[PDB]
């Protein structure tokens, strides 16, 4: 790696996880709106200047699903860029949450609902264009491999 | 994460992993030459299209320097662009040995060797300049707060 390169900063920083129940449901949020129902997306937030991204997304996912999660494996980071200029990595962890736990949502002007999802419906979802970033469905299908689960319907 | 943003392509990925012993030594890779010595960083490979960055770490931590190790958290990622326009993403784990290994570096075209290298002596090598990524500092730094180690010699 002696081969010289400059860096390219990176302002914002995302955490979140796929995180899958026994049976291979994905855990998803709703946005509140955009007649039509606001798009799904994985439980992800802004990691703090600083901050462990990894621990970024378990607290993140705490936040916004009321579940305790753990990370369990590292899937995959990627890059956007806003139309200002400015960069932001997602940074994506497979979780599992910590037994005996209740799905309870936390309701604001940006999350609607969060919920588990199965394979079959999330693939109807996807083709119907209500899946928010596309990478969604790219970590759910790595996810499902990882844990040994059936691919999705396809 | 509804506000529209493009996706920014980067074509290669790099894992690595800052390895500490029980003593919060660290482990580097060192370059074959560049009467100057190569320069020393952390063990690290490319990960291969589609492969997981985490298991990619690992396979290159023992490709580099023959030993095996578990990686235990996630320290963050970087964003580096060559003279051709490409870009490339490092990833790093804090990571640990498996027990009972000895340390047998794979000498190549661009490996000299690798050793464990105590804080007070990497801190030398740093201010030395001997540091090819200065991150490995930023990084060592972090993985010895994670572990409840002494910070580096300031």
Redesign the interface.
Known sequence: ??????????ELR?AGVVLLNERGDILLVQ?KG?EKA??W?IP?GAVEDGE???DAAVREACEETGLRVRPV???????????DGV???R?V?LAEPEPGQTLAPAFTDEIAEASFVSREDFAQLYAAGQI??YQTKLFYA?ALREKGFPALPV
Not at 1 to 10: A, I, L, M, N, S
Request: hydrophobic share 40%; proline share 8%; aromatic share 10%.
């Open positions: 790696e002696h081969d010289e390169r400059t860096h390219v900063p990176v995302a946005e955009i606001g798009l997306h992800s462990n991204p990894q494996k590292f899937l995959g980071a990627y890059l956007g860029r806003f139309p960069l932001i990595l940074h962890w928010r970033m790595d």
